[PDB]
Write an enzyme that holds these catalytic residues in place. Structure first.
Site, PDB file in Angstrom:
ATOM      1  N   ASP A  46      47.408  32.771  50.953  1.00 13.13           N
ATOM      2  CA  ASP A  46      45.952  32.403  50.931  1.00 13.13           C
ATOM      3  C   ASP A  46      45.397  32.424  49.491  1.00 13.13           C
ATOM      4  OD1 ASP A  46      43.459  32.028  52.796  1.00 13.13           O
ATOM      5  OD2 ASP A  46      42.893  33.540  51.274  1.00 13.13           O
ATOM      6  N   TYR A  51      39.514  31.652  43.120  1.00 12.40           N
ATOM      7  CA  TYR A  51      40.307  32.830  42.766  1.00 12.40           C
ATOM      8  C   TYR A  51      40.966  32.657  41.396  1.00 12.40           C
ATOM      9  CZ  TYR A  51      39.917  33.532  47.900  1.00 12.40           C
ATOM     10  OH  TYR A  51      39.446  33.592  49.173  1.00 12.40           O
ATOM     11  N   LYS A  80      40.863  26.401  49.321  1.00 14.02           N
ATOM     12  CA  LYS A  80      39.485  26.350  49.769  1.00 14.02           C
ATOM     13  C   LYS A  80      38.641  25.628  48.736  1.00 14.02           C
ATOM     14  CE  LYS A  80      40.091  31.153  51.592  1.00 14.02           C
ATOM     15  NZ  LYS A  80      40.867  31.846  50.546  1.00 14.02           N
ATOM     16  N   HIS A 113      34.896  26.984  51.859  1.00 13.39           N
ATOM     17  CA  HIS A 113      34.967  28.391  51.526  1.00 13.39           C
ATOM     18  C   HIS A 113      33.769  29.207  52.038  1.00 13.39           C
ATOM     19  CE1 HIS A 113      36.972  31.071  48.196  1.00 13.39           C
ATOM     20  NE2 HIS A 113      36.472  31.883  49.162  1.00 13.39           N
ATOM     21  N   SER A 151      35.300  28.834  56.458  1.00 10.51           N
ATOM     22  CA  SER A 151      35.309  30.231  56.132  1.00 10.51           C
ATOM     23  C   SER A 151      33.886  30.654  55.976  1.00 10.51           C
ATOM     24  CB  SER A 151      36.100  30.482  54.877  1.00 10.51           C
ATOM     25  OG  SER A 151      36.221  31.866  54.509  1.00 10.51           O
ATOM     26  N   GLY A 205      39.761  46.751  54.253  1.00 14.36           N
ATOM     27  CA  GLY A 205      38.525  47.349  53.802  1.00 14.36           C
ATOM     28  C   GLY A 205      38.069  46.833  52.456  1.00 14.36           C
ATOM     29  N   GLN A 207      38.647  45.057  48.394  1.00 12.85           N
ATOM     30  CA  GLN A 207      38.972  45.660  47.091  1.00 12.85           C
ATOM     31  C   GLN A 207      37.781  46.432  46.475  1.00 12.85           C
ATOM     32  OE1 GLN A 207      41.565  43.180  44.520  1.00 12.85           O
ATOM     33  NE2 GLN A 207      41.604  41.636  46.208  1.00 12.85           N
ATOM     34  N   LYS A 255      46.013  41.579  51.070  1.00 13.72           N
ATOM     35  CA  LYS A 255      46.257  41.493  49.634  1.00 13.72           C
ATOM     36  C   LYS A 255      46.892  42.820  49.217  1.00 13.72           C
ATOM     37  CE  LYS A 255      44.979  42.854  45.266  1.00 13.72           C
ATOM     38  NZ  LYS A 255      44.548  44.249  44.804  1.00 13.72           N
TER      39      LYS A 255
HETATM   40  N1  NAP Z   1      37.179  33.449  52.438  1.00 12.37           N
HETATM   41  C1  NAP Z   1      36.631  34.334  51.618  1.00 12.37           C
HETATM   42  O1  NAP Z   1      35.459  34.291  51.272  1.00 12.37           O
HETATM   43  C2  NAP Z   1      37.460  35.537  51.240  1.00 12.37           C
HETATM   44  C3  NAP Z   1      36.822  36.723  50.813  1.00 12.37           C
HETATM   45  C4  NAP Z   1      37.581  37.843  50.520  1.00 12.37           C
HETATM   46  C5  NAP Z   1      38.950  37.766  50.615  1.00 12.37           C
HETATM   47  N2  NAP Z   1      39.608  36.590  50.985  1.00 12.37           N
HETATM   48  C6  NAP Z   1      41.089  36.434  51.049  1.00 12.37           C
HETATM   49  O2  NAP Z   1      41.483  37.553  51.817  1.00 12.37           O
HETATM   50  C7  NAP Z   1      42.495  38.237  51.074  1.00 12.37           C
HETATM   51  C8  NAP Z   1      42.454  39.751  51.416  1.00 12.37           C
HETATM   52  O3  NAP Z   1      41.152  40.496  51.393  1.00 12.37           O
HETATM   53  P1  NAP Z   1      40.722  41.405  50.201  1.00 12.37           P
HETATM   54  O4  NAP Z   1      41.100  40.824  48.837  1.00 12.37           O
HETATM   55  O5  NAP Z   1      39.366  41.917  50.442  1.00 12.37           O
HETATM   56  O6  NAP Z   1      41.704  42.723  50.226  1.00 12.37           O
HETATM   57  P2  NAP Z   1      42.370  43.532  51.538  1.00 12.37           P
HETATM   58  O7  NAP Z   1      43.438  42.776  52.183  1.00 12.37           O
HETATM   59  O8  NAP Z   1      41.275  44.064  52.371  1.00 12.37           O
HETATM   60  O9  NAP Z   1      43.090  44.749  50.707  1.00 12.37           O
HETATM   61  C9  NAP Z   1      42.272  45.719  50.082  1.00 12.37           C
HETATM   62  C10 NAP Z   1      43.101  46.695  49.264  1.00 12.37           C
HETATM   63  O10 NAP Z   1      44.108  47.201  50.192  1.00 12.37           O
HETATM   64  C11 NAP Z   1      45.171  47.680  49.323  1.00 12.37           C
HETATM   65  N3  NAP Z   1      46.384  47.671  50.141  1.00 12.37           N
HETATM   66  C12 NAP Z   1      47.080  46.636  50.523  1.00 12.37           C
HETATM   67  N4  NAP Z   1      48.111  47.049  51.271  1.00 12.37           N
HETATM   68  C13 NAP Z   1      48.031  48.378  51.407  1.00 12.37           C
HETATM   69  C14 NAP Z   1      48.821  49.358  52.047  1.00 12.37           C
HETATM   70  N5  NAP Z   1      49.887  49.074  52.812  1.00 12.37           N
HETATM   71  N6  NAP Z   1      48.403  50.667  51.967  1.00 12.37           N
HETATM   72  C15 NAP Z   1      47.307  51.162  51.179  1.00 12.37           C
HETATM   73  N7  NAP Z   1      46.541  50.075  50.528  1.00 12.37           N
HETATM   74  C16 NAP Z   1      46.925  48.762  50.671  1.00 12.37           C
HETATM   75  C17 NAP Z   1      45.271  46.678  48.153  1.00 12.37           C
HETATM   76  O11 NAP Z   1      45.418  47.349  46.876  1.00 12.37           O
HETATM   77  P3  NAP Z   1      46.843  47.100  46.075  1.00 12.37           P
HETATM   78  O12 NAP Z   1      46.828  45.653  45.513  1.00 12.37           O
HETATM   79  O13 NAP Z   1      46.736  48.143  44.975  1.00 12.37           O
HETATM   80  O14 NAP Z   1      48.005  47.390  47.022  1.00 12.37           O
HETATM   81  C18 NAP Z   1      43.942  45.925  48.261  1.00 12.37           C
HETATM   82  O15 NAP Z   1      43.294  45.756  47.003  1.00 12.37           O
HETATM   83  C19 NAP Z   1      42.008  37.970  49.568  1.00 12.37           C
HETATM   84  O16 NAP Z   1      43.040  38.346  48.575  1.00 12.37           O
HETATM   85  C20 NAP Z   1      41.811  36.465  49.683  1.00 12.37           C
HETATM   86  O17 NAP Z   1      43.102  35.815  49.823  1.00 12.37           O
HETATM   87  C21 NAP Z   1      38.853  35.448  51.296  1.00 12.37           C
HETATM   88  C1  10H Z   2      30.215  37.168  49.759  1.00 15.05           C
HETATM   89  C2  10H Z   2      29.096  36.108  50.150  1.00 15.05           C
HETATM   90  C3  10H Z   2      28.241  36.729  51.260  1.00 15.05           C
HETATM   91  C4  10H Z   2      28.942  36.827  52.598  1.00 15.05           C
HETATM   92  C5  10H Z   2      29.483  35.468  53.006  1.00 15.05           C
HETATM   93  C6  10H Z   2      30.465  34.943  51.968  1.00 15.05           C
HETATM   94  N1  10H Z   2      30.009  35.053  50.572  1.00 15.05           N
HETATM   95  S1  10H Z   2      30.189  33.779  49.520  1.00 15.05           S
HETATM   96  O1  10H Z   2      30.677  32.560  50.266  1.00 15.05           O
HETATM   97  O2  10H Z   2      29.067  33.619  48.581  1.00 15.05           O
HETATM   98  C7  10H Z   2      31.553  34.418  48.576  1.00 15.05           C
HETATM   99  C8  10H Z   2      32.873  34.306  49.051  1.00 15.05           C
HETATM  100  C9  10H Z   2      33.929  34.828  48.270  1.00 15.05           C
HETATM  101  C10 10H Z   2      33.672  35.454  47.052  1.00 15.05           C
HETATM  102  N2  10H Z   2      34.636  35.989  46.241  1.00 15.05           N
HETATM  103  C11 10H Z   2      34.360  36.228  44.819  1.00 15.05           C
HETATM  104  C12 10H Z   2      35.690  36.743  44.191  1.00 15.05           C
HETATM  105  C13 10H Z   2      36.624  36.972  45.374  1.00 15.05           C
HETATM  106  C14 10H Z   2      35.859  36.403  46.570  1.00 15.05           C
HETATM  107  O3  10H Z   2      36.376  36.252  47.689  1.00 15.05           O
HETATM  108  C15 10H Z   2      32.345  35.535  46.573  1.00 15.05           C
HETATM  109  C16 10H Z   2      31.297  35.012  47.344  1.00 15.05           C
END
Ligand code: NAP
Ligand code: 10H
Length: 306
Positions: A46, A51, A80, A113, A151, A205, A207, A255
């Site tokens: 993803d 990003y 996205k 996105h 998304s 939870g 980053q 992630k």
């Molecule tokens: N569509 C959107 O708007 C949107 C928004 C947010 C995220 N995303 C996507 O969703 C993906 C994941 O969500 P996210 O970035 O919020 O992070 P997440 O998957 O919620 O992970 C959060 C933290 O968990 C830690 N972690 C991972 N595996 C672990 C394990 N087995 N045990 C203990 N800790 C662990 C990682 O730190 P370490 O790296 O140190 O292991 C990571 O920084 C993003 O990278 C991106 O691809 C999309």
């Molecule tokens: C976080 C806001 C409010 C909740 C819905 C989604 N968004 S968003 O579409 O403005 C958005 C989405 C992703 C991000 N983002 C910034 C760096 C990593 C990441 O996912 C920032 C804003």
């Protein structure tokens, strides 16, 4: 491993690798960890224009294809469309640009996105998202994206697309924040009723980036019910959080930029939770979106208004 069949007949692996890292992480780390993810068994990857890593992620994919580890068709790659590119004439060029950065001929999945349109070429814009969605459908017809989805949509926003006159392709998914403190049950039920996959981000939870996350907010991976369940199953709180999603029919991202945690996360397939475990996790829901910033909350299409 396993896959879910999307509503357009293509298949999406149920566990995804999250590639986002904040800017203090050197860009080249994305290349390295994406290769490790693929070595551990991740096949869904993803990314997004936002990003700022598509070039490193695409290079990881091409390196693992170039050395025989995988074929292109075994990888499910998502990008996205960023919210400054909602105007329909901007959609295909945005997708083409992502493809050039990643050096791929197609994406397996392309998402709008966010519903929160922003002013192009530079603060909110008002765009008819049904026109953006038509532009998305065109990208599927051209073979640039195998599948298209959204998304950060809420139920009303998704319905607007589903009820579009002349709709050609439903979204295959809605990628949204989803975890035991914000489990999105009612949105999930709605998605399930329309054969749209909910894909969970921040499933571990988040980053907890100081730009958008309150450091007072509860640390999901320190939760005492997850910790109790981790001890019961002899797994880890992260694995309990991931497995929860899988058993709810949610495609889950994870992630990690850490080699050991990357390898640990594929173990989600190695064990199961009981109905009582799942009920205990369902008990944690508390309307907690980690992304909680003044910079978003006043947007006219902010999704957490509903
Ligand atoms: N569509 C959107 O708007 C949107 C928004 C947010 C995220 N995303 C996507 O969703 C993906 C994941 O969500 P996210 O970035 O919020 O992070 P997440 O998957 O919620 O992970 C959060 C933290 O968990 C830690 N972690 C991972 N595996 C672990 C394990 N087995 N045990 C203990 N800790 C662990 C990682 O730190 P370490 O790296 O140190 O292991 C990571 O920084 C993003 O990278 C991106 O691809 C999309
Ligand atoms: C976080 C806001 C409010 C909740 C819905 C989604 N968004 S968003 O579409 O403005 C958005 C989405 C992703 C991000 N983002 C910034 C760096 C990593 C990441 O996912 C920032 C804003």
């Amino acid at each position: 491993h396993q896959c879910v069949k999307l509503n357009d007949g293509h298949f999406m692996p149920v566990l995804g690798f999250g590639t986002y890292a904040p800017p203090e992480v050197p860009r080249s780390k994305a290349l390295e960890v994406t290769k490790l993810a693929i070595e551990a068994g991740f096949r869904h990857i993803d990314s997004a224009h936002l990003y700022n890593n598509e070039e490193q992620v695409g290079l990881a994919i091409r390196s693992k294809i170039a050395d025989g580890s995988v074929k292109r068709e075994d990888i499910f790659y998502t990008s996205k469309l960023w919210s400054t590119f909602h105007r329909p004439e901007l959609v295909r060029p945005a997708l083409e640009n992502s493809l050039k950065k990643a050096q791929l001929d197609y994406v397996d999945l392309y998402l709008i996105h966010s519903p929160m349109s922003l002013k192009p070429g530079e603060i909110f814009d008002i765009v008819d998202l049904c026109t953006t969605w038509e532009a998305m459908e065109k990208c599927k017809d051209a073979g640039l994206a195998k599948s298209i989805g959204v998304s950060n949509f809420n139920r009303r926003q998704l319905e607007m697309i589903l009820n579009k006159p002349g709709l050609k392709y439903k979204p295959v998914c809605n990628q949204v924040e989803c975890h035991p403190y914000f489990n999105r049950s009612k949105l999930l039920d709605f998605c399930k009723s329309k054969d749209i996959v909910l894909v969970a981000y921040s499933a571990l939870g988040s980053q907890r980036d100081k730009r958008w996350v309150d450091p007072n907010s509860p640390v999901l991976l320190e939760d005492p019910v997850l910790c109790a369940l981790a001890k019961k199953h002899k797994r880890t709180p992260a694995l309990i959080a991931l497995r929860y999603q899988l058993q709810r029919g949610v495609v889950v991202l994870a992630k990690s930029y850490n080699e050991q945690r990357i390898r640990q996360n594929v173990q989600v397939f190695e064990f199961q939770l009981t109905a009582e475990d799942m009920k205990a996790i369902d008990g944690l829901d508390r309307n907690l979106h980690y992304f909680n910033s003044d910079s978003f909350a006043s947007h006219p299409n902010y999704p957490y208004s509903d």
